[PDB]
Design an enzyme around this catalytic site. Structure first.
Site, PDB file in Angstrom:
ATOM      1  N   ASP A  63     -29.994 111.326 -61.044  1.00 20.01           N
ATOM      2  CA  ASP A  63     -30.667 112.608 -61.248  1.00 20.01           C
ATOM      3  C   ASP A  63     -32.195 112.486 -61.214  1.00 20.01           C
ATOM      4  O   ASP A  63     -32.819 112.123 -62.212  1.00 20.01           O
ATOM      5  CB  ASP A  63     -30.214 113.191 -62.594  1.00 20.01           C
ATOM      6  CG  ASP A  63     -30.783 114.572 -62.863  1.00 20.01           C
ATOM      7  OD1 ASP A  63     -31.605 115.061 -62.063  1.00 20.01           O
ATOM      8  OD2 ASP A  63     -30.396 115.169 -63.889  1.00 20.01           O
ATOM      9  N   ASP A 106     -34.732 117.662 -56.884  1.00 18.72           N
ATOM     10  CA  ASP A 106     -33.799 117.463 -57.994  1.00 18.72           C
ATOM     11  C   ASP A 106     -32.365 117.167 -57.539  1.00 18.72           C
ATOM     12  O   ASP A 106     -31.641 118.075 -57.136  1.00 18.72           O
ATOM     13  CB  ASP A 106     -33.790 118.711 -58.882  1.00 18.72           C
ATOM     14  CG  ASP A 106     -32.883 118.560 -60.092  1.00 18.72           C
ATOM     15  OD1 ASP A 106     -32.511 117.417 -60.423  1.00 18.72           O
ATOM     16  OD2 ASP A 106     -32.542 119.592 -60.709  1.00 18.72           O
TER      17      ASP A 106
HETATM   18  C1  LIG Z   1     -39.066 116.704 -65.562  1.00 21.37           C
HETATM   19  C2  LIG Z   1     -38.927 117.697 -66.733  1.00 21.37           C
HETATM   20  N1  LIG Z   1     -38.422 116.995 -67.927  1.00 21.37           N
HETATM   21  C3  LIG Z   1     -39.478 116.296 -68.713  1.00 21.37           C
HETATM   22  C4  LIG Z   1     -39.046 115.738 -70.064  1.00 21.37           C
HETATM   23  N2  LIG Z   1     -37.598 115.702 -70.329  1.00 21.37           N
HETATM   24  C5  LIG Z   1     -37.324 115.177 -71.686  1.00 21.37           C
HETATM   25  C6  LIG Z   1     -36.695 113.790 -71.791  1.00 21.37           C
HETATM   26  S1  LIG Z   1     -35.199 113.711 -70.854  1.00 21.37           S
HETATM   27  O1  LIG Z   1     -35.513 113.279 -69.521  1.00 21.37           O
HETATM   28  O2  LIG Z   1     -34.193 112.997 -71.601  1.00 21.37           O
HETATM   29  N3  LIG Z   1     -34.591 115.330 -70.717  1.00 21.37           N
HETATM   30  C7  LIG Z   1     -33.788 115.975 -71.799  1.00 21.37           C
HETATM   31  C8  LIG Z   1     -35.176 116.216 -69.766  1.00 21.37           C
HETATM   32  C9  LIG Z   1     -34.251 116.884 -68.923  1.00 21.37           C
HETATM   33  C10 LIG Z   1     -34.688 117.585 -67.790  1.00 21.37           C
HETATM   34  C11 LIG Z   1     -33.732 118.306 -66.957  1.00 21.37           C
HETATM   35  O3  LIG Z   1     -32.878 119.053 -67.441  1.00 21.37           O
HETATM   36  N4  LIG Z   1     -33.958 118.244 -65.614  1.00 21.37           N
HETATM   37  C12 LIG Z   1     -33.236 119.133 -64.696  1.00 21.37           C
HETATM   38  C13 LIG Z   1     -34.256 119.692 -63.658  1.00 21.37           C
HETATM   39  C14 LIG Z   1     -35.531 120.263 -64.301  1.00 21.37           C
HETATM   40  C15 LIG Z   1     -36.785 119.921 -63.679  1.00 21.37           C
HETATM   41  C16 LIG Z   1     -38.017 120.403 -64.235  1.00 21.37           C
HETATM   42  C17 LIG Z   1     -37.983 121.219 -65.412  1.00 21.37           C
HETATM   43  C18 LIG Z   1     -36.739 121.568 -66.044  1.00 21.37           C
HETATM   44  C19 LIG Z   1     -35.509 121.091 -65.490  1.00 21.37           C
HETATM   45  C20 LIG Z   1     -31.995 118.496 -64.032  1.00 21.37           C
HETATM   46  O4  LIG Z   1     -31.483 119.340 -62.995  1.00 21.37           O
HETATM   47  C21 LIG Z   1     -30.852 118.338 -65.022  1.00 21.37           C
HETATM   48  N5  LIG Z   1     -29.684 117.728 -64.323  1.00 21.37           N
HETATM   49  C22 LIG Z   1     -28.520 117.631 -65.239  1.00 21.37           C
HETATM   50  C23 LIG Z   1     -28.056 119.020 -65.680  1.00 21.37           C
HETATM   51  C24 LIG Z   1     -27.831 119.289 -67.065  1.00 21.37           C
HETATM   52  C25 LIG Z   1     -27.417 120.587 -67.498  1.00 21.37           C
HETATM   53  C26 LIG Z   1     -27.234 121.614 -66.525  1.00 21.37           C
HETATM   54  C27 LIG Z   1     -27.448 121.373 -65.132  1.00 21.37           C
HETATM   55  O5  LIG Z   1     -27.233 122.464 -64.279  1.00 21.37           O
HETATM   56  C28 LIG Z   1     -27.426 122.306 -62.865  1.00 21.37           C
HETATM   57  C29 LIG Z   1     -27.865 120.058 -64.703  1.00 21.37           C
HETATM   58  C30 LIG Z   1     -36.067 117.619 -67.463  1.00 21.37           C
HETATM   59  C31 LIG Z   1     -37.054 116.950 -68.288  1.00 21.37           C
HETATM   60  C32 LIG Z   1     -36.607 116.251 -69.472  1.00 21.37           C
END
Ligand SMILES: CCN1CCN2CCS(=O)(=O)N(C)c3cc(C(=O)N[C@@H](Cc4ccccc4)[C@H](O)CNCc4cccc(OC)c4)cc1c32
Length: 374
Positions: free
Chosen positions: A217, A32
């Protein structure tokens, strides 16, 4: 060796094999670039096949500090500690690293994903609880002689690719590498200076593209766009594809579109060009995204008379996110040493017989405005 050391399932992240503790406990860890904590399931959970058992590691050390991390999707809480970590199909080194042992979580782990933890590869500035918790890659670089650089080749249920640690594998891309500056070391923040849909400029003040930041990302699936840009993009894509009308729910990502197997009308969907800031004043290069990338296949045996897709572009209130579907088919070099991100066409690039994903430049702009939001 390191080539092809990533696996995954579409829309569920790409993971690498790692070991933690002594003796080594094997775990698959999601790669990530959009966060900075190394965290692993450390207690039973319905979706975990295995988890980190601190009691069985003689080298574990508790840091007596809790930690909570909320992502865009999902959140977890855990206990901080350190232990020895290795990457079996990476550099043959062993490092002591901070590890968050996840003891509770909400909508984080995914049923059937086959990973049990997450490797945040961004900078300490966004590590929780604060920036004194040294991220894994920083630890790797400090404790070994690995060059301060890594590259990701993500390929498009089962997916694969390579994470090349410490260097660039030239057999993984063709053509030139183009570099865009890392604007700030927290996320891998970059600057988008122009967006075109089928060659047609979206015609916005370019700061709109980067409100309030743009990041690269691997841990987010979609291309996420600020509301104003998202709405303009949807309008432009609808108009290009107007020969077919889809429910508004499709455009919101709340509904699949399906066609009879093998008959997806790729040619009615436009290419999206993202122009990234270059290394020289008012110069840029573009990467081009085909619908084979931003229409994400959803594998399901029940629907398998058809090919079905989700619209993998969605609205954001936290800035642009160039997620996995954007990185796919490109070789992306995270050159921390020289504060730059390089893009090249990948060995596993997307294309049909009419169009192909591309990385090309240079382009010049006369408007000397800064496209950075802050
Ligand atoms: C791969 C899992 N997954 C599948 C589906 N979707 C939905 C559609 S989408 O891609 O638009 N979206 C909202 C989605 C968003 C995220 C998501 O938040 N992925 C994080 C890692 C992660 C990996 C596996 C499970 C859960 C989270 C990143 O790290 C965020 N990077 C930006 C960020 C934002 C806020 C705080 C922060 O703190 C460090 C960092 C994941 C998905 C979706």
């Amino acid at each position: 060796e390191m080539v092809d050391n990533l696996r995954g399932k579409s829309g569920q992240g790409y993971y690498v094999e790692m070991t933690v503790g002594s003796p080594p406990q094997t775990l698959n860890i999601l790669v990530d670039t959009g966060s900075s904590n190394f965290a692993v399931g450390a207690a039973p959970h319905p979706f975990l096949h295995r988890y980190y058992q601190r009691q069985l590691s003689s080298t574990y050390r508790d840091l007596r500090k809790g930690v909570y991390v909320p992502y865009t999707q999902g959140k977890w809480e855990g206990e901080l500690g350190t232990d020895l970590v290795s990457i079996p199909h990476g550099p043959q080194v062993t490092v002591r690293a901070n590890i968050a042992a996840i003891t509770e979580s909400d909508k984080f782990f995914i049923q059937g994903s086959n990973w049990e933890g997450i490797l945040g590869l961004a900078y300490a500035e966004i590590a929780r609880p604060d920036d004194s918790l040294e991220p894994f890659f920083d630890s790797l670089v400090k404790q070994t002689h690995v060059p301060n650089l890594f590259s990701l080749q993500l390929c498009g249920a089962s997916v694969g690719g390579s994470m090349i640690i410490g260097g660039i594998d030239h057999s993984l891309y063709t053509g030139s590498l183009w570099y865009t500056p890392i604007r700030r070391e927290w996320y891998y923040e970059v600057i988008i200076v122009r967006v075109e849909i089928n060659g047609q400029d979206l015609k916005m003040d370019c700061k709109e593209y980067n409100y309030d930041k743009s990041i690269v990302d691997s841990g987010t699936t979609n291309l996420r766009l600020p509301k104003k840009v998202f709405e303009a993009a949807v309008k432009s894509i609808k108009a290009a594809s107007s020969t077919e009308k889809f429910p508004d729910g499709f455009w919101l990502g709340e509904q699949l579109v399906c066609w009879q197997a093998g008959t997806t009308p790729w040619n009615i969907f436009p290419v999206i060009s993202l122009y990234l800031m270059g290394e020289v004043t008012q110069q840029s290069f573009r990467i081009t995204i085909l619908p084979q990338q931003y229409l994400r296949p959803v594998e399901d045996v029940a629907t398998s008379q058809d090919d079905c897709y989700k619209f993998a572009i969605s609205q954001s209130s936290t800035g642009t996110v160039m997620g996995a579907v954007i990185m796919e088919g490109f070789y992306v070099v995270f050159d921390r040493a020289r504060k730059r991100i390089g893009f090249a066409v990948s060995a596993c690039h997307v294309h049909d017989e009419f169009r192909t994903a591309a990385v090309e430049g240079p382009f010049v702009t006369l408007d000397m405005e800064d496209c950075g939001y802050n």
